[PDB]
Write a protein that binds this ligand. Structure first.
Ligand SMILES: Nc1c([N+](=O)[O-])ccc(Oc2ccccc2)c1Cl
Ligand SMILES: Nc1c([N+](=O)[O-])ccc(Oc2ccccc2)c1Cl
Ligand code: NA
Ligand code: NA
Lengths: 116, 116, 116, 116
């Protein structure tokens, strides 16, 4: 599991389920190329985004559709989405967990990076 | 103003107004003695808790009554309070801003420490 | 697993390993009775603190020794410890995950509460 | 002052000083157009980015150059930048404070939205 995303809900004290996100990789012309995507499970986790061989050096952007999540709960949010932009695999493969904790007007994000 | 506390509401995107808090200082017998108390203003800030002369070296605890805050908004929150425990003025007088960002099931707290 | 604590390190991007903590339960005289304790594993997690039958209604305090964690890394921290105080099991058993994300001058904490 | 950004350093317990950031606004063709830029002061705050007349309805992005900040302190951070994307002034003019709390592998961001 080279890249996993975990999302939590700070209002309900629960995993954030069915949160959609796309992953992009920065292209040579500075545009964002589609790379992976999915929705969080009932555990708030999204596994299986990529494989070790496909996940090479680059700048990656995880764009998490937090706005649709809050609107489904009938809550008006601040952000259009939560974006996480980072260089990955510059020193060869690593395993990355991107975590996000969501509130309607705030989010926090952290990374856990491990050498396989 | 050597000690200031600022509290923000991550659900509503606003200062957390009229939040009560109590400050304690550890006594020689290791019990918590009352030190100061107050409530946040319309800006979410509590100023004037202490003075340079009174705010001596010690271990201090700020106990923020987050539970009453959420209950008054019709939210049943997770925590009884948000607690911040720290040694102050160990290397001479400093000015401390304690900030807290509140959600029903989560809080974040940070400190800004400056040398006058 | 009625009560689990997970701790992450925001400076190193890693689980916070070997973080010691004690759990207390508030007694009828408002004192804090010892309840459980342990240290986080290499995954940053502490499992096995209690059992469903022992973990009944009460106000619980998880006192996480963040200061010793940072001092072992040669980093001077702000807080004496990170405290998480919450009522548990007031509506019968639940499963609780307490998570904390640590920085030298800040911490964030959230809860995931699930009905078994 | 309809838009202000405040940045704090969770490692040092200080304002994050001399942090560069760029603000963009989504154009009719869905591209990001430059809107304003600046750097935080000794208080960690960036004031004067825009005016009430210029700060019309739209989708805005604040891109905070956290990577250069950490690198100058000798830290190799995780994120390329901290990004905040939001719709502004949808229901008439508001005043926005965007706050960010920075660690090498994590950031938290919140908004305070007030009606003048
Ligand atoms: N994370 C955080 C916390 N915190 O205690 O973690 C407190 C406040 C906060 O926003 C502000 C608000 C005012 C000044 C600086 C930062 C954030 Cl963004
Ligand atoms: N904010 C935060 C907190 N927290 O106690 O606030 C704890 C953990 C965390 O990342 C994770 C990491 C793994 C699983 C769930 C969340 C974040 Cl992002
Ligand atoms: Na001293
Ligand atoms: Na409108």
């Amino acid at each position: 599991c080279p890249l996993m995303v975990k999302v939590l809900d700070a209002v309900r004290g629960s995993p954030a389920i069915n949160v959609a996100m796309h992953v992009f990789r920065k292209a040579a012309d500075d545009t964002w190329e589609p790379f992976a995507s999915g929705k969080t499970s009932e555990s708030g986790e999204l596994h299986g985004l990529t494989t070790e061989e496909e996940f090479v050096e680059g700048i990656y952007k995880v764009e998490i559709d937090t706005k649709s999540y809050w609107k489904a709960l009938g809550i008006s949010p601040f952000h259009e989405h939560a974006e996480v932009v980072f260089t990955a695999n510059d020193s060869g493969p690593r395993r990355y967990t991107i975590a996000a904790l969501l509130s309607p007007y705030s989010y926090s994000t952290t990374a856990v990076v491990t050498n396989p």
